[PDB]
Structures are given as structure tokens and as C-alpha cells.
Design an enzyme around this catalytic site. Structure first.
Site, PDB file in Angstrom:
ATOM      1  N   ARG B 142       0.831  -1.202   0.000  1.00 24.01           N
ATOM      2  CA  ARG B 142       0.000   0.000   0.000  1.00 24.01           C
ATOM      3  C   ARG B 142       0.861   1.247   0.000  1.00 24.01           C
ATOM      4  O   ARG B 142       1.952   1.263   0.578  1.00 24.01           O
ATOM      5  CB  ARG B 142      -0.900   0.035   1.230  1.00 24.01           C
ATOM      6  CG  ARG B 142      -1.856  -1.144   1.369  1.00 24.01           C
ATOM      7  CD  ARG B 142      -2.984  -1.052   0.368  1.00 24.01           C
ATOM      8  NE  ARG B 142      -3.815  -2.251   0.416  1.00 24.01           N
ATOM      9  CZ  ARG B 142      -4.892  -2.476  -0.334  1.00 24.01           C
ATOM     10  NH1 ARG B 142      -5.320  -1.579  -1.231  1.00 24.01           N
ATOM     11  NH2 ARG B 142      -5.556  -3.617  -0.175  1.00 24.01           N
ATOM     12  N   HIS B 190      -1.480   0.479  -9.840  1.00 19.52           N
ATOM     13  CA  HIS B 190      -2.090  -0.399  -8.853  1.00 19.52           C
ATOM     14  C   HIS B 190      -2.780  -1.598  -9.478  1.00 19.52           C
ATOM     15  O   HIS B 190      -3.966  -1.875  -9.216  1.00 19.52           O
ATOM     16  CB  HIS B 190      -3.036   0.341  -7.896  1.00 19.52           C
ATOM     17  CG  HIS B 190      -3.170  -0.320  -6.549  1.00 19.52           C
ATOM     18  ND1 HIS B 190      -3.532   0.367  -5.410  1.00 19.52           N
ATOM     19  CD2 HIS B 190      -2.966  -1.599  -6.157  1.00 19.52           C
ATOM     20  CE1 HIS B 190      -3.552  -0.459  -4.379  1.00 19.52           C
ATOM     21  NE2 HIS B 190      -3.214  -1.660  -4.808  1.00 19.52           N
TER      22      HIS B 190
END
Ligand code: CL
Lengths: 256, 200
Positions: B142, B190
């Protein structure tokens, strides 16, 4: 020890510091103990080759060129993405190199099948023979060439072979990857198939005439990766350990 | 929705980054752009230590696959873990882990224990003794686990030799970000693992 090697000179010079604890004729021979394959059998060549093959399969699977083109535009955009299990990698050549690559590609999740002219029985891999070539090709999304150059493999990677590769995979068009020998491909056919879209992309480490001409169209193509015949390179430090050991043992293998 | 393919997808991305950096993809593409045929001196995977922070399901899967490809692999987690086939380090062993690592891979969840963990002081402890003389940073956990200003400063100074980033502090990554144009940084939006919508 006389050293006359047409390798990267900086890597040779650096590797002499420690080796043979030295008449370096660039101030043990390769285009003047042989420097490559008393021969030198570099045991790391197989694993190095599989790094290159794995890298190509991932670059194509993971749409690296499309993502780099997006990055050049500073554009954040996710693309639809198959997993490795959605792609069949078909390897032509089931010797040491093909077997190593097959096992590693399968462990990463790819579907893998193999081909050789005469049937081989390879644990864990479905294999095809000369009579089964059409069936093998029709199942294959990413064709990987790991064949030697023999009269039976001269120009084997040609327009008709590319046209029989699968168009049913997730990209709708096959990819060609070759790290065997350039004499096994018909380069004019590769170029024409890329231009027409019969091949969606390629990775080429080997060419009909090496070094590849600066005028070759392969250099600028958006879906072709060119490497200068470096899928596996020997470490010159490993060569000298081989020469040191064989020089020492003779003072106290691999004769041609 | 627990997509069972996420682990294997993540390991594809991680493997790809480690090979892109190992095999000097950017340098060879720059050569290709010049139409210049030139072999570069090339370490094998066994010359590079990949250090993975995060030894849950994702880290374990990646570690096993990287080791099978020939990489030297070590793992880290705050708590002591015994992982079959992989040397691991704990909280007390963090500095030792970092000093052994050439390619740092982040596969951590975002918790208070991992917030901003990938920072300038951490990057300064990574190995410079590997074959490229400078460490590489790869993150697919993350964005909240990294300090982007520190990543940029470390790339500018050469403390980091390159990076692969799939996650960012603010997504989508701004078009003004300096990450997009850097010669040794790979940016992905992502997508290290995407769920298949037919499976949902
Ligand atoms: Cl054969």
C-alpha cells in the site's frame, strides 16, 4: 597465463584481480583453454537462459509496452489483465534448456506444452512430436524457441508456422520468442507477420545476421524486444576458476 | 470477495520487477533506441539478494518463486516467523536484514506498524555491495507504507538506484509526479493483482 578474449574488456580486466594468484594480450583464448563451449562448460547457462525466457513471457503477459506507453503520457489507466494460467506457452525444443524453462514457467502459473521432432517423454509436461506439430501450434499463445540449429530447424519459424499459432488466447494474436539461433527463423516472415498483425509481438535475442544491422526495422517496433544475443552470458570470473582448477589438477577434464 | 487468484497474480508482478532490474531492461531498451548492438556485463539471479518485508501469504509465495528462479531470498516480519525454505529476520533483526538486501520488496499490509516504513532512513541501511552498487525498491503493498518525498530524494541522490512502484500515497498518481519520467523507475497503476470480474 596468456589471456586473449574478445569479451567485455572491462569485465576481463576486473576479473584478473584475484585470478591466477598474467599476460593479458588486450593491453585462455577466445578468438585470439577455450573461453566458451579443454572446453569451458559454464554450469550457470541454463538458469541464466530461463531468467530471460521468464522475463519475456512476463513482459508480454503483463502488457509492459502498453503500460510504458501510458506512463509516457503520465496517464493512470488499468488494463484488463489475464493471469498466467490463461496463456499457453509452447516450447519448441525439449533439451536441457526447454525442460528448465518449462518447469519454471509452469511453477509461475503458465500452461506449458512442449514439442520436439521425435517424441520425448517429459515428466509434468504434455509433449508433441513432428506429426503433432499442427495441434501443438494451435494450442500455443506464446511460442518459445529453444532449438539448436540443424538442417531440420533451418527456417522452421516461418510465416506458415506463425499462421498456425493460436488466436484464441487473451490477446487475440500469438507472440514469438526466440533465443536459440537466428538461422532457425525466416526474418522477413517475422517482420511481415508483425506488420500484418499475424504476430502481436515478439522477443528476439538471435538474428539471421549478427550483430543486427542498425538499419533493421526490429529496433523501433512497439511490440518487439531486442537483446544482443545475451539470453545467457558466461561470467569470465567463472572461466578463470575453471582454468585455475584444471591448471592446478594438471600440476598435481573436458578435453575435446 | 476473496479472489483466489490474487496471490499468484501478485507473484507474477514481483517476479517481473526483479527480472527487469536484474536483466538491465532499461539499459538494453536505451541501446535499442540507438540501434546499438552491445552486450552488458550481467550478474545471474544468484548474485542478487531479494529481501521481502512482509512474510504473510503474499511474501511467502513470492519468496518461494524467486528462490526457484535462482535469487538469494530473505524475509522480514516484525514477529519471529519460521518459514520453510526461507531465512527470516524479526524486529530486532531489521538492520541486519536491510544490510543484506539488494532489491527490497514490500508486500506488507497497511497498519500502524507499517505506516511510512519505507523511508529515507530505511533506504540508507540497504546494501550497496550487490552487483549494481546501489539498492532497488519495489512496492506492491500500500502507498501509505512509503514516504514518496524520500523515495524521490533517494533516487536523485543515488541512495536508490531504481524502483518499481505499483502503489502511491495518493492514487491515481498525479500527472505532475516526477515518477513518470524517471529512467530507472517503473510505474504501474495499482495492478500488481487485478480481480477477474466474471469470478465476482
Ligand atoms: Cl527437435
Amino acid at each position: 597465463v596468456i589471456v586473449d578474449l574478445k569479451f567485455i574488456p572491462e569485465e576481463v580486466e576486473a576479473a584478473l584481480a584475484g585470478a591466477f594468484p598474467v599476460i593479458d594480450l588486450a593491453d585462455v583464448v577466445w578468438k585470439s583453454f577455450s573461453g566458451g563451449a579443454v572446453r569451458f562448460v559454464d554450469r550457470t547457462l541454463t538458469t541464466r537462459m530461463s531468467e530471460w525466457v521468464m522475463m519475456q513471457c512476463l513482459l508480454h503477459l503483463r502488457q509492459h509496452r502498453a503500460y510504458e506507453a501510458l506512463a509516457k503520457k503520465h496517464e493512470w489507466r488499468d488494463l484488463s489483465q489475464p493471469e498466467a494460467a490463461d496463456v499457453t506457452v509452447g516450447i519448441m525444443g525439449m533439451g536441457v534448456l526447454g525442460q528448465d524453462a518449462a518447469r519454471k514457467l509452469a511453477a509461475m502459473g503458465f500452461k506449458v506444452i512442449g514439442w520436439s521432432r521425435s517424441k520425448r517423454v517429459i515428466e509434468g509436461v504434455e509433449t508433441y512430436d513432428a506429426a503433432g506439430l499442427d495441434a501443438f501450434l494451435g494450442r500455443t499463445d506464446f511460442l518459445v524457441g529453444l532449438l539448436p540449429l540443424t538442417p531440420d530447424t533451418r527456417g522452421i519459424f516461418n510465416a506458415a508456422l506463425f499462421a498456425k499459432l493460436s488466436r484464441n488466447g487473451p490477446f487475440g494474436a500469438p507472440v514469438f520468442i526466440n533465443a536459440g539461433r537466428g538461422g532457425s527463423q525466416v526474418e522477413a516472415d517475422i517482420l511481415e507477420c508483425l506488420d500484418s498483425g499475424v504476430l502481436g509481438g515478439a522477443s528476439l535475442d538471435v538474428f539471421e545476421r549478427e550483430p543486427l544491422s542498425p538499419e533493421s526495422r526490429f529496433w523501433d517496433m512497439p511490440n518487439v524486444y531486442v537483446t544482443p544475443h545475451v539470453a545467457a552470458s558466461s561470467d569470465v570470473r567463472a572461466l578463470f576458476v575453471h582454468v585455475e582448477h584444471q591448471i592446478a589438477r594438471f600440476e598435481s577434464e573436458h578435453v575435446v
